[PDB]
């Protein structure tokens, strides 16, 4: 019996024998005629999206892409970016996402580091990649008709699903991300009826909360243009105009909203702990306001907190099947109250840092207190924390 190890709810059924392609293919076959993507006035259905991405994936397979390969992704915000991400996924490979504003030299560095077999871009952007040695395919050429269908080798849960980036490549597995999706959505509860704002760059974790939760339940995505992403008041009006029901964002953006958006079902605030003033402003009755915390090394999020006016803001309790404990300099578990390094365990702990066994073995360590085979690996956040007399974890800055 120990009050110094804090777990999320027990849900072994969130650990399935699945991969991202399985989740999306299920959603697309179940709701082919449902609209999946919205870009201004263009709309694509789940069935249309699935077929187009499958054609692109067969083209990747023809060009030599197989499960376990890493494919760079660099396209403008929009339907084509998401379709290309999905095409990489359907091919069985993991994608390395690049923000719109990534300099070509950084792209080259990341592709080299990951040993990527190639990357997807557009014709317009293809010219900008002269100094990139790796193979560069255009969505256009990958969308050409095929004279015969190509069988796609399936990938395994232990294979990478994506790699998030001097550069540190964090390797997230199919297992990691599929479990994270099911775990967080058991609490958030994104529904198929929802209309979800898609404003994050695919290089950030919260883009997964936007896109792939929606894929999981078949919600509809309204993809924000680059112009809108930097205009909080124009965005505050756009959310009302399009009647978006789900918004993932960081506290500062919400704090820059002039009025309320009453038609927002769920408000998931990542990035930073929400200030009390923003809670009192937005934790309204017709709003379910959440604050999600977690390092990229444990798949998007690790804990989630339901915000309420007058309830002090904390990082919440771990997500289902996630766990948190506090250790000291000697890598040994501390009794409650005595502060130390916050560590996270569970099935969504990343594989580690790509091609850097030194640092990986330094920060991903054996868990001597695992109560199952999914808890055998602790990621040391580098944060300092303590468990209070309420079983709640409190962050206390960096080490
Ligand atoms: N919901 C989590 C917020 C995003 C944070 N994990 C990050 O590393 O960017
Ligand atoms: Mg991090």
Residue numbers in the entry: 7 to 171, 178 to 411
What did the original publication write about this model?
Here, we report a δ-poly-L-ornithine synthetase from Acinetobacter baumannii, which we name PosA. Activity analyses show that the A. baumannii homolog activates L-Orn and the full-length protein produces isopeptide polymers in vitro.
To better understand the substrate binding in PosA, we solved four structures of the isolated adenylation domain. Glu221 showed charged interaction with terminal δ-amine of ornithine substrates or the ε-amino group of lysine indicating an important role in binding. Density for both ornithine isomers was unambiguous; the electron density for the lysine ligand was less complete for the carboxylate and amine, suggesting the longer substrate may adopt multiple conformations in the active site of the crystallized protein. Michaelis-Menton kinetics showed a preference in the apparent kcat/KM of over 160-fold for L-ornithine compared with L-lysine.
